[PDB]
Design a binder for this molecule. Sequence first.
Ligand code: IPT
Ligand code: IPT
Ligand code: MG
Ligand code: MG
Ligand code: MG
Ligand code: NA
Ligand code: NA
Ligand code: NA
Ligand code: NA
Ligand code: NA
Lengths: 1015, 211, 174
Amino acid sequence: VVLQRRDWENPGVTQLNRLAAHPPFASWRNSEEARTDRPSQQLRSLNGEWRFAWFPAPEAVPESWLECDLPEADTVVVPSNWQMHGYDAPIYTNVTYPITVNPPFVPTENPTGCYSLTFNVDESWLQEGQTRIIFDGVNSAFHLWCNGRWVGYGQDSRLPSEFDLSAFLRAGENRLAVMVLRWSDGSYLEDQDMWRMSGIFRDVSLLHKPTTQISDFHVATRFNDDFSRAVLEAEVQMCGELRDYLRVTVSLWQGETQVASGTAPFGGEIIDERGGYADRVTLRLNVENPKLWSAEIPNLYRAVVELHTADGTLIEAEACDVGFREVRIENGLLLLNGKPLLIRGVNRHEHHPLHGQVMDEQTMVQDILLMKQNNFNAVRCSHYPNHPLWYTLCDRYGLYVVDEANIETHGMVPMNRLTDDPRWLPAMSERVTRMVQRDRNHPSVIIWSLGTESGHGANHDALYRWIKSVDPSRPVQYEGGGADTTATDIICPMYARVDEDQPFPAVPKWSIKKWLSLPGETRPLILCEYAHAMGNSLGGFAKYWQAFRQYPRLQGGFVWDWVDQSLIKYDENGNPWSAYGGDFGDTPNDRQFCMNGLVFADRTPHPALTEAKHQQQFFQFRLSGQTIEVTSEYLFRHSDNELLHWMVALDGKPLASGEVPLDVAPQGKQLIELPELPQPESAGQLWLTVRVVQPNATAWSEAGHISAWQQWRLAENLSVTLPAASHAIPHLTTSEMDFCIELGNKRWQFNRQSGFLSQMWIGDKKQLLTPLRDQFTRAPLDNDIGVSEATRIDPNAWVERWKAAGHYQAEAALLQCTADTLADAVLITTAHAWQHQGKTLFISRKTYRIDGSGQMAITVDVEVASDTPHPARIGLNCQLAQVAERVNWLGLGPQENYPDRLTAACFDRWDLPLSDMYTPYVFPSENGLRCGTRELNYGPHQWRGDFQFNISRYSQQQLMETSHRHLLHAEEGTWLNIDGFHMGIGGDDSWSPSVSAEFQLSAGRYHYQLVWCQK
Amino acid sequence: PNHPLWYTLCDRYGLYVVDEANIETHGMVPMNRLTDDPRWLPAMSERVTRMVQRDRNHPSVIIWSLGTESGHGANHDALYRWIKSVDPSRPVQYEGGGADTTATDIICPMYARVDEDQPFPAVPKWSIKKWLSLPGETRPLILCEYAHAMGNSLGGFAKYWQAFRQYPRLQGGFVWDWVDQSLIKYDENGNPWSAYGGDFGDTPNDRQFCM
Amino acid sequence: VVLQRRDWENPGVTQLNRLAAHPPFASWRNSEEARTDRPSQQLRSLNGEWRFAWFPAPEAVPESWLECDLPEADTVVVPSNWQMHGYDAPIYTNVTYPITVNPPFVPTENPTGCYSLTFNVDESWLQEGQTRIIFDGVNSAFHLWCNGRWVGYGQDSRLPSEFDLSAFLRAGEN
Ligand SMILES: CC(C)S[C@@H]1O[C@H](CO)[C@H](O)[C@H](O)[C@H]1O
Ligand SMILES: CC(C)S[C@@H]1O[C@H](CO)[C@H](O)[C@H](O)[C@H]1O
Ligand SMILES: [Mg+2]
Ligand SMILES: [Mg+2]
Ligand SMILES: [Mg+2]
Ligand code: NA
Ligand code: NA
Ligand code: NA
Ligand code: NA
Ligand code: NA
């Protein structure tokens, strides 16, 4: 009958014989174990070695598999995704569905995972009460059998399905058989931009509950206006036989202290003409001066819910952590405990490079710590309810959570084709209702979300009202269909820009500043997604935080996103590499679009992470004279674990430093008076650097963790001294093909046919492998490429503008190349015109002045045609012969930084191994730039001026011809790119031009100068 | 929802119609046990959605109703909003759980009296004159059921109509009801007689209350 | 499948293969007839004499009935309530449920009406287009079979259940 029905092609059937959803249960039989949250003997894990077979369709499954283990089957670990064991390929597709859009039908070729487990059940479990099995995550649908007999069916990949097995089990050995379908009608609601995988990918467990049981419970906390008094209100529901002697005690614990308690018989107040719930009771406990919960200080109490007899004999106990906090939207602001929030948030998919979409404690804890260490206070569960441990950890470490229903229909045309259809309302309701029923007691959850990218349909409106109806404690948000519809309490656009309107028809993304004040609008604005961190990105991130700070109603947003969705593959030798869309044979695919992380799949930071930590700082700084003004952006806590380290350096040389403890109240100010700074009698720029240090370890950080920093230029003393003139004067050696300049061991050569420095010699040895030439291009970034492909060009992307204008294949044409012997130097003048198909793109006018001290002063003046697309950069490159261990520079650093992403970088003297000057982006592009650099040192070379540079063993050309990082080979010598000017990287999104006007190279005429010498 | 022809006739002869979903859970304890249970939302929604999709073009339909005597549950709320979302042209009314919940655009009590308060716990039937002016209340009041016409009845009918006329916001009501639900039985001689509850062997029954 | 599933004791199955609801259709092929609201050749009444048998439970319904008329069955007029024909009793209850309140379950003794009809279909409806059957009201749930093959299932006594019979029909007798 199971093959006959095809429930996996019926959106009307989303479960069979499935128990109601409810908050996390453990069925403790001792109230103390409940209080302390110790393991419970009534909740057994079924995780571990299971038997697995793969089949191309459910019709291909043999009927014997219900009765006997299959010999051809293997033994695999559960939980797991079966794509992660090599049974089939994972598919990466963004928008377009991984299957043909023919609702409600799926392909007849429907990969089918048959899982089985022979396991033991004790006698005690079967003489009394109720034995249920819980599947926390099954992708995407499944039928369940126990000892040959059919139990039930379930959908929704991301919420627990629970089945009563009491009537199916026997003492001793038992066998489960689980038929998991890759594709079902649920897939239509699971079109998240992520790897499409399947199987039993979350925990499986058995729970024993008494016959008379707690079947549900809800905890609410309400406050007076100043938060000095709370009422905890706990509503408890039982199943079983209703008897007079039945009682519930809800008791509230702070550590080992019981702060409050209440006990009542069942039978709530009269509700309507037929009475009340005889199977319910509401307990109300008064709490004076409650410790409030926030992400800053996650104060938790323990609620123990005891079901017992009048006389005091326990039946069972459940429990949860309670955070006393109010979430309300008042007067257009989202308030926590009466204070306006500034969401420093991130989107976080559940992703692991080895285990796929299986989650474990270690990884979750690792994620939380990195998040907090980098100044995040919020996470969006993009785009499904998470592993249940996640909320628990968020409660305990303190993050604000957006809990999001598992509904995404992005690939539909138009996006709301299902969500407007009343026939898909049942399947949608269950994905929202079952989330609320499960997660509503977690204080970390502050906002409910109706899903993502499903357009705006009437079903959203119904479910919005439903949530507001059952849970008035939390705002409901939803971005779809324009981000400000009647199904959202919060204007929550994705990738809406700061100042720039993008007025799309029907779904405009307004400038977020403009959006707030549209006629009639009053709601707060928090971006559900912003700052697409794909490859070398996060350009313009500071612009967001400047606006968030200035506008009370701009209350932050969630970065897209936390971690790259790269997956580990292995080569012939056996070494791992990071893989994206299309690397498992999967087609069609959206390639590197699965990697948008602030961190790599192994949780190593991208350079952008540091930019986020800095902009997301909690202490603001202003300098007047010798006074640092510190302002706190904390809402609740004092800076009771903070000192300020100040430091003054002259072009990187330390002159003074000190420490002052920070004692600033939430939203408050502290003035720090620096001691007399010693005026240096030496040319240079004085810089002030302050760093906020946490001297003590926390649950989330180590002692000496730096949480904030800032810099200022203090006094500058410009160099008025002429260098001591030299005896020697360089000699010019004119040839047919060459101008050679000699001075001591040093020699320069200008090729008269190309017009460039073709070679330099120090003593005997050659310094160049490639001549010094102008460069106007870069290995295109993900943002430069957007959605452009080889077989579907987007002529709007920066890369295509560059290609079509001939930037990548323009040829230097020599207009001029003269030599002149001066009094104490040799002067080489040049002029080039870069042309493509008769159009002059660029003109470079240079002079090289080689003086008697062996220094070469290079002066570059570039004309850029007003009607050519603005170039990626205006600089020079060459390939040096030298491979040295270290790079030393006076500029912004130490990490990679670009004109629109340099706020986190500090001006100082930095020294790193060459390998740190390369950023290993999985899709290779221009990388490792450092800006505002006054001096660069590499081997015997030193460059001086005011430039940006990158330095690496990889040419711009190899970076742009290579698709994966691991396929890069180190070239001979070191590619040096020195830019006078470099275009922003953008990232407001990654599918249109996103580089802001003020970071484009549009001036038409550009000037830079460099001195080159041996030291 | 009625036989489709009823709406056509009302369109053409001229009657205002309250079109009502086929949802009644009166015998539940308490009355909202189903309608507050999310597992019953699917079944409930199809009873509301499929009504609106069918009858939304009839001009005679001026008010949608979410059903009757099913208490007030969160499912009413979702469905209220569903209708308001798909058809802003018509008010949505529903009596359950006190006649003035958030699932109704109209205070629509049943058998609320003119001057006499009946202060039942949780679900009081206030005097309709009094109901209109309860703190914060602004809605119109039309009784979904009044003047129970059972047997020799309709005493005090004039009192309703005097109040309906004097109070702009008391905008009338629906008598309970049009036609006796008596069925024809035939005796030993084959002579027709009027039958109510209990006359078909039916037990437990509620006797003449079908009339 | 049909009897093992017990779709009538499941609030999650309220229909199987039912067509989407919609305002009244007549599929006129002449604009003037549509304007005047005159009859339409594309909408046929199947009201009249059908065949009917009563059963104490769905378990008691013989499998032969899907393939052939039951000889003991009577000819009755449809539409009708089978209590008005005297097959069992109509029950009058006000508030209290006519059955034991135990959701989602109903009594095992569940009176089953077995209605059948033999009818012809116009030549042209089989070659081209879509032919659906509409049941304006069925109390309280039903399974539908056309020519021995199962079509679908319906709930809600008071709204039309509709099913595509396009692939079920044959020339001559259905
Ligand atoms: C127009 C498309 C690029 S949509 C775009 O794709 C992104 C790729 O990372 C993210 O998934 C966003 O959520 C989505 O809005
Ligand atoms: C308290 C009960 C009498 S309820 C009362 O019964 C009436 C009897 O005809 C009607 O059915 C009303 O709708 C109902 O409210
Ligand atoms: Mg299904
Ligand atoms: Mg998407
Ligand atoms: Mg059913
Ligand atoms: Na703000
Ligand atoms: Na993506
Ligand atoms: Na590349
Ligand atoms: Na009036
Ligand atoms: Na009656």
